[PDB]
Design a protein around this motif. Structure first.
Motif, PDB file in Angstrom:
ATOM      1  N   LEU A 757       0.821  -1.204   0.000  1.00  0.00           N
ATOM      2  CA  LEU A 757       0.000   0.000   0.000  1.00  0.00           C
ATOM      3  C   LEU A 757       0.859   1.259   0.000  1.00  0.00           C
ATOM      4  O   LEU A 757       0.614   2.185  -0.783  1.00  0.00           O
ATOM      5  CB  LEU A 757      -0.945  -0.003   1.202  1.00  0.00           C
ATOM      6  N   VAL A 758       1.873   1.309   0.866  1.00  0.00           N
ATOM      7  CA  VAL A 758       2.689   2.514   0.987  1.00  0.00           C
ATOM      8  C   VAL A 758       3.447   2.782  -0.307  1.00  0.00           C
ATOM      9  O   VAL A 758       3.494   3.921  -0.788  1.00  0.00           O
ATOM     10  CB  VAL A 758       3.641   2.399   2.191  1.00  0.00           C
ATOM     11  N   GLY A 759       4.047   1.746  -0.896  1.00  0.00           N
ATOM     12  CA  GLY A 759       4.811   1.951  -2.115  1.00  0.00           C
ATOM     13  C   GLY A 759       3.960   2.447  -3.267  1.00  0.00           C
ATOM     14  O   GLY A 759       4.355   3.359  -3.996  1.00  0.00           O
ATOM     15  N   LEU A 760       2.777   1.860  -3.444  1.00  0.00           N
ATOM     16  CA  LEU A 760       1.916   2.263  -4.549  1.00  0.00           C
ATOM     17  C   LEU A 760       1.246   3.607  -4.296  1.00  0.00           C
ATOM     18  O   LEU A 760       0.894   4.304  -5.254  1.00  0.00           O
ATOM     19  CB  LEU A 760       0.867   1.186  -4.824  1.00  0.00           C
ATOM     20  N   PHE A 761       1.056   3.990  -3.032  1.00  0.00           N
ATOM     21  CA  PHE A 761       0.563   5.330  -2.745  1.00  0.00           C
ATOM     22  C   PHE A 761       1.668   6.375  -2.788  1.00  0.00           C
ATOM     23  O   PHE A 761       1.368   7.573  -2.839  1.00  0.00           O
ATOM     24  CB  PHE A 761      -0.131   5.363  -1.383  1.00  0.00           C
TER      25      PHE A 761
END
Length: 983
Positions: A757-761
Motif C-alpha cells: 500500500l505505501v509503495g503504490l501510494f
RNA sequence: GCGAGCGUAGUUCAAUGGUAAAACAUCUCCUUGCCAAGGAGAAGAUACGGGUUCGAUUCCCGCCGCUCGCCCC
C-alpha cells in the motif's frame, strides 16, 4: 487410409476454391503470426468484398525450445481464411469443410468455447470462439471489430486452422516428428534443419549489436516512406522492424522498462500507416465494389431468440433481463397472464407465458383536468380550459363532475380505454423488449444493432397465429432448429401449446436446472464402477452446465506414474484447462487414475475417450518435465533470479520488495505484541518468502502461486513452523477464502500489505470507482479482515510511518494520512455489511479508527446497548451542554477554581464531575460508560435551570464555560454524539 | 473529440400535460431568562433558451455544468 500432410492442403484448398474464395501465395517477409500478413491487415479496411484463403508459415523466436518439446516449435504452418462480408453461413461452411477434410462430424465432439482475441501491437480486437475437438484446440473463429484504429465496416470473419496439430491428433502419433508429410516421407526428417539451427541462432548466437541498430533504422525508413504516400513498402518495412523486436526478446536483452517504449513506438507506426491505405484506395473509386445497408380463449405464448453460442456468464443475465422486463410490459398494457417462466440454452433464450387473453380490459378511467376555479368562472359559460379539455378528450360538457380534494377540489371526467385485439400490441412492442437487453460486451454482424452474439432466428408464437415482427432483418416465423447434423435439422411447431414437448422429442434438455440433475446423477453412478466419488466445485459445474445442449458423461483412464506429482497440480490441470471431473477414492482419499468428461449430443463412445485420454496424458508429460527440471535445485537459489519480474516502474522488481519486507518485519512483529522468543524464526521465513514466483511450475500455472512454495520448503527439510508461514503470505487470495491462523504468518501478511500500500501510494496511483490498476481496495479489505478476524491489537498510524521509512524515495506526510483515511473508509464498508446501522459506525470510526479490532468490538456492542431504552436519555443529556459551547471561546483560557464559585448547585455538579471522571479514561470500554454516566444527569437539570449561565460577569462566565466544556468533553476518547440518530 | 445518465428550497427528497408537496436547517414569536423540551407562523425551488398546445418539472430541439464508458494513456 490415413490422411497425410501434403494432401490436407490439397483438400483445404480445392474446397474453399468452390465456395468462391481466391487462393493466393504465402507471405514474403518473416511474419510473427498469421494475421500481420498484408493480405489480411490492410485489406479488411474499406468497403470492398474480399474472400481469400491461403497458407503461411509462422515464425516466433520466443517459442524456441531447441526442437524437442512436442508442442512448441519455432516454425508452424497455419491456414488463414478471410471472408467479407459474412454471408450468414459463417459456421456452417466451416463444418462442411471439416467433413470434407476427412474427419466425420457425427462421431466427434465438435464444440465451440468462447475466447476473445485482442492484440495491442497493431490495435485489433473482436469476438469469437475456439473449436474443441475431443479436447484439442484446432481452430480459431473470430468476427473482427476494429483494425488499427478505424472501425470495421462491414465486419469480417477470420478462420484460422492450426494445421500442425490437426494431423498430429488425427493420425495417432505422440511426437511431432512422427507426422508423415507424404506416403513415403515424414515431417520430422526434412523440417528439422530449419528448426535446430534456427533455435541455436535465436537462443545464444544472435548478435545483438546489429539488431538494436537495425530496429531504429527500419522505423525511420518506414516513417520516411509513409510521409511520401507510399503505403505498401511502408507497411512492409514494419514487419521486418517488428521481427527484430521479437528476436531481441528471444535473446533476453530487453528490460522491463523498454517494453512499453517499443510497444508504443510500434503501435503508433502501425496506427499512422493503417489510416493511409483507406485514404489511398478511396481516390481510385473502389474498383472491386461497394457495400450498402372475435373473442376466444387465453392460449399460450412462446418467445424464442435463437442465436449462436453465448458465453456461460451471459445466458444467466439475459434470461433474467428478458423475463423480468417482459412481466412488466403486459402489466403496462393491462394484459392478463398466468404462470411465466424462462429457459436458457447456449443457443436460445426462451420465455413461455401461459393463459394470455386475446383482448384487453375495456374499462373506463377518470382523468384529472384543470382546477375547478380556473376552468369555471363565477358566472357565464365555462372558460377556455373546459372547452379545450372537452375537445381534447371528445366528451360532452355535462359529463364534468366535481370531487372534493386538496384546496381546489377538482374537475373530473370519464373516458374509455380503446381495447385492442391483444396482438397488434405485441407486434408494436416486441422490437423494444428484445432490444432492451444489454451485455458487458457486444458486436455487429450486418447492421448497427448491438448484441452479444449474432441472432439467427426468432420464433414468436401466440396460440395458433403468428405474431408478425421483424428484428435485425429476420422475420419471426414457426420454425426452430435442433441439434446440428441431426435428423431434426429444423422442425415446424404447429401450435405454441405443443412446444416444450417437441424440444424434449429432439433431445434438448432446455431447462437450466434440469441438466444439473442429469449430470450429477450419472457422474456419481459412473464413479462406483471404480469405487470412488467425484469432485464438484460450484464454479466448475455452473460453467459446465451452460456449455452442453444434451449432456452425456464418459469416464477415462490415465497411467499411474503421474501420481508422483503434487496433489494440487493434477486437480488444477484437470479443472482449469479441460474442465474434467477428478475422482477420489472413498478409502485412502487421494487421487485416482480416472476422470469424467461431458460430451455433447449423440457421439461414438470409444472415439471420444480414445482421443481425450491422449490429450490428458499429453499435458501431464509437460507438467512432469517442468516439475523435474524445477526440483533440480533447492528453493534458496530461486531467490536470486526473480529480478525478471517487475513490481512497479518507479519502485522496481520483487527483490527490493522482499528486502524491504525482511528489513521492516521486526518492528511490525513488536507492534502486534508477539513474544520475543519467536522472533528468530520470523527473521528466517522472510529469507525465503515469496520465492515460488520465479519457479517453473508457477510461470504458467498462475493459480498455484503460494502453495508450491510450501511444498518446496517441506521437501527441502525445514521445520513445519516456517512452511505454513510461507504458504499463508498470500491469504486471502479471493473473496471467501480462508484467513491466516498462525502467528508468524500474520506478521508477514500484514507487512506485505502495508508495504504494497505505501509503495503504490508513494507514486500516486489512487484507483477510481471503476478502474483497478492494482486492486488496492482488495489489499485494504484483506488487511482489515486479517486484523479483525484474528483479534489482534494494532496501531495503524504508528506502523505506517515505520513502513514508509525504508521506501527508496522520500514520501511526504500527506500520503500516510490519505492511506489511513482510505483504510478507515474500507473499514466502514466492512462494518456496514453485517447489519450495523450506518449512523453508529459513522460516529464510532471518527474517534476509534486507530485499532480496527477495537472499533469492530465497540461498534458491534454499542448498537446492542442502544436498545436499553435509556440510551436517548444519555444522548440528550451529555451533549445538551455541547450546543452551548460553540460560539464564544473566552472560557478556554482558564480552568475551574474554588474561590469565585457560586451557589452549591455548581459545586455539587463539579463534585459529581470529579467523581465520575475517575472511571472515564481513554483506555476504557463502553460496558461501564453509561452505568457511570447515569449519576451525572440529575444535577445537570438543576444546574441549567438555576445558574443563569448568561454572561453577565466576565470571570463567572469564563469559569462556567470552562466547567461546562470539561463536563461535555468526557466522551472524547470513546465515541462521538454528533452523528447520533437521537439528536 | 465520441455515447449514456443527469440537473427541483441552503442539504436530502414528492408528483403528473394544469392553481407546485414534506423533513431538516434559518428566522419571527408563545413557556420563567440563555441550549434541551411542547406550540404557531414566516421566508425558501424546477441549470438556461426556444418551439407547439388554452396550458409542459412532464413532449421536441438548442446550450451550461456534473458523473461514467470509449478516444488518448
Amino acid at each position: 487410409s490415413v490422411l497425410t500432410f501434403q494432401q490436407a492442403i490439397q483438400r483445404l484448398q480445392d474446397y474453399w476454391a468452390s465456395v468462391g474464395c481466391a487462393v493466393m501465395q504465402c507471405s514474403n517477409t518473416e511474419v510473427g503470426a498469421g494475421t500481420m500478413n498484408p493480405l489480411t491487415f490492410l485489406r479488411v479496411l474499406g468497403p470492398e468484398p474480399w474472400n481469400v484463403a491461403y497458407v503461411e508459415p509462422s515464425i516466433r523466436p520466443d517459442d524456441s525450445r531447441y526442437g524437442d518439446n512436442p508442442n512448441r516449435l519455432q516454425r508452424h504452418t497455419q491456414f488463414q481464411v478471410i471472408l467479407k462480408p459474412d454471408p450468414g453461413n459463417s459456421q456452417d461452411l466451416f463444418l462442411h469443410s471439416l467433413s470434407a477434410l476427412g474427419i466425420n462430424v457425427r462421431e466427434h465432439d465438435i464444440r465451440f468455447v468462447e475466447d476473445n482475441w485482442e492484440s495491442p501491437v497493431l490495435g485489433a480486437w473482436g469476438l469469437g470462439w475456439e473449436v474443441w475437438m475431443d479436447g484439442m484446440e484446432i481452430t480459431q473463429f473470430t468476427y473482427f471489430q476494429q483494425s488499427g484504429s478505424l472501425p470495421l465496416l462491414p465486419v469480417s470473419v477470420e478462420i484460422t486452422y492450426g494445421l500442425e496439430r490437426i494431423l498430429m491428433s488425427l493420425q495417432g502419433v505422440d511426437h511431432f516428428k512422427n507426422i508423415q508429410y507424404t506416403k513415403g516421407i515424414t515431417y520430422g526428417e526434412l523440417f528439422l534443419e530449419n528448426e535446430k539451427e534456427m533455435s541455436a541462432y535465436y537462443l545464444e548466437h544472435a548478435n545483438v549489436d546489429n539488431i538494436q541498430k537495425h530496429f531504429d533504422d527500419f522505423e525511420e525508413e518506414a516513417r520516411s516512406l509513409l510521409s511520401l504516400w507510399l503505403p505498401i513498402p511502408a507497411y512492409d518495412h514494419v514487419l521486418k522492424a517488428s521481427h527484430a523486436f521479437n528476436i531481441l526478446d528471444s535473446r533476453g536483452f530487453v528490460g522491463v522498462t523498454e517494453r512499453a517504449r517499443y510497444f508504443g513506438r510500434m503501435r503508433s507506426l502501425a496506427r499512422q500507416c493503417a489510416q493511409l491505405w483507406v485514404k489511398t484506395r478511396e481516390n481510385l473509386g473502389y474498383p472491386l465494389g461497394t457495400y450498402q445497408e372475435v373473442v376466444g380463449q387465453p392460449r399460450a405464448f412462446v418467445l424464442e431468440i435463437g442465436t449462436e453460442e453465448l458465453p456461460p456468464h451471459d445466458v444467466i443475465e439475459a434470461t433474467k433481463q428478458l423475463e423480468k422486463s417482459l412481466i412488466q410490459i403486459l402489466e403496462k398494457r393491462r394484459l392478463s397472464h398466468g404462470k411465466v417462466r424462462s429457459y436458457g440454452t447456449p443457443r436460445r433464450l426462451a420465455v413461455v407465458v401461459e393463459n394470455l387473453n386475446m383482448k384487453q380490459m375495456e374499462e373506463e378511467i377518470e382523468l384529472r383536468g384543470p382546477p375547478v376555479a380556473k376552468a369555471f368562472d363565477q358566472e357565464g359559460r365555462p372558460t377556455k380550459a373546459a372547452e379545450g379539455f372537452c375537445r381534447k378528450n371528445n366528451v360532452p360538457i355535462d359529463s364534468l363532475y366535481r370531487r372534493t380534494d386538496g384546496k381546489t377540489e377538482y374537475i373530473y371526467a370519464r373516458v374509455k380505454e380503446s381495447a385492442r385485439f391483444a396482438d397488434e400490441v405485441l407486434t408494436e412492442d416486441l422490437p423494444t423488449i428484445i432490444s432492451g437487453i444489454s451485455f458487458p460486451k457486444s458486436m455487429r454482424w450486418n447492421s448497427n444493432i448491438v448484441f452479444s452474439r449474432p441472432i439467427r432466428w426468432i420464433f414468436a408464437l401466440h396460440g395458433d397465429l403468428i405474431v408478425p415482427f421483424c428484428f435485425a432483418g429476420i422475420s419471426s416465423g414457426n420454425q426452430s432448429c435442433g441439434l446440428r447434423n441431426s435428423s431434426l435439422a429444423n422442425f415446424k411447431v404447429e401450435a405454441a401449446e405443443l412446444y416444450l414437448h417437441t424440444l424434449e422429442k429432439a433431445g434438448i434438455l432446455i431447462d437450466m436446472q434440469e441438466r444439473k440433475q442429469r449430470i450429477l446423477h450419472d457422474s456419481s453412478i459412473l464413479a462406483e464402477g471404480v469405487g470412488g466419488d467425484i469432485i464438484a466445485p460450484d464454479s466448475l459445474v455452473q460453467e459446465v452446465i451452460n456449455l452442453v445442449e444434451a449432456p452425456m458423461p464418459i469416464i477415462g483412464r490415465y497411467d499411474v506414474s503421474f501420481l508422483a506429482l503434487p496433489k494440487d497440480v493434477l486437480i488444477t490441470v484437470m479443472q482449469k484447462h479441460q474442465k474434467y471431473f477428478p475422482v477420489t477414492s472413498k478409502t485412502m482419499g487421494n487421487l485416482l487414475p480416472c476422470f469424467i468428461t461431458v460430451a455433447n449430443g449423440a457421439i461414438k463412445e470409444e472415439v471420444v475417450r480414445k482421443g481425450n485420454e491422449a490429450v490428458l496424458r499429453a499435458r501431464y508429460e509437460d507438467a512432469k518435465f517442468f516439475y523435474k527440471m524445477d526440483t533440480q535445485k533447492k528453493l534458496s537459489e530461486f531467490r536470486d533470479q526473480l529480478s525478471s519480474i517487475l513490481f512497479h516502474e518507479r519502485l522496481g522488481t520483487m527483490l527490493d520488495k522482499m528486502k524491504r519486507v525482511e528489513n521492516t518485519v521486526a518492528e511490525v512483529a513488536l507492534l502486534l505484541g508477539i513474544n520475543e522468543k519467536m522472533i528468530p524464526a520470523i527473521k528466517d521465513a522472510a529469507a525465503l518468502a515469496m520465492s515460488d514466483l520465479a519457479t517453473n511450475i508457477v510461470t504458467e500455472f498462475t493459480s498455484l502461486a503460494g502453495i508450491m512454495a510450501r511444498h518446496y520448503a517441506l521437501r527441502d527439510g525445514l521445520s513445519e513452523q516456517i512452511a505454513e508461514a510461507l504458504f499463508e503470505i498470500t491469504l486471502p487470495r479471493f473473496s471467501g477464502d480462508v484467513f491466516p491462523k498462525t502467528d508468524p504468518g500474520i506478521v508477514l501478511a500484514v507487512t506485505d500489505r502495508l508495504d504494497s500500500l505505501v509503495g503504490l501510494f508513494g507514486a500516486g496511483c489512487q484507483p477510481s470507482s471503476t478502474n483497478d490498476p492494482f486492486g488496492l481496495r482488495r489489499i485494504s479489505y484483506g488487511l482489515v479482515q486479517i486484523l479483525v478476524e484474528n483479534k489482534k491489537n494494532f496501531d495503524l498510524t504508528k506502523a505506517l510511518t515505520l513502513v514508509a521509512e525504508e521506501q527508496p524515495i522520500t514520501i511526504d506526510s500527506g500520503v500516510i494520512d490519505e492511506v489511513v483515511q482510505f483504510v478507515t473508509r474500507r473499514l466502514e464498508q466492512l462494518l456496514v455489511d453485517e447489519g450495523i446501522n450506518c449512523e453508529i459506525v459513522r460516529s464510532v470510526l471518527i474517534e476509534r479508527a486507530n485499532c480496527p479490532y477495537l472499533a469492530s468490538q465497540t461498534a458491534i456492542e454499542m448498537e446492542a446497548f442502544s436498545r436499553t431504552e435509556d440510551f436517548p436519555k444519555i444522548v440528550e443529556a451529555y451533549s445538551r451542554p455541547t450546543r452551548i459551547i460553540r460560539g464564544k471561546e473566552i472560557g478556554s483560557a482558564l480552568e475551574v477554581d474554588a474561590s469565585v464559585f457560586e451557589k452549591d448547585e455548581e459545586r455539587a455538579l463539579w463534585s459529581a464531575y470529579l467523581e465520575v471522571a475517575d472511571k472515564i479514561h481513554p483506555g476504557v470500554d463502553i460496558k461501564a460508560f453509561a452505568d457511570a454516566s447515569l449519576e451525572l444527569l440529575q444535577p445537570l437539570e438543576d444546574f441549567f435551570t438555576n445558574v443563569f449561565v448568561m454572561a453577565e460577569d466576565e470571570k463567572v462566565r469564563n469559569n462556567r464555560l470552562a466547567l461546562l466544556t470539561k463536563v461535555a468533553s468526557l466522551p472524547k476518547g470513546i465515541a462521538d454524539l454528533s452523528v447520533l440518530p437521537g439528536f
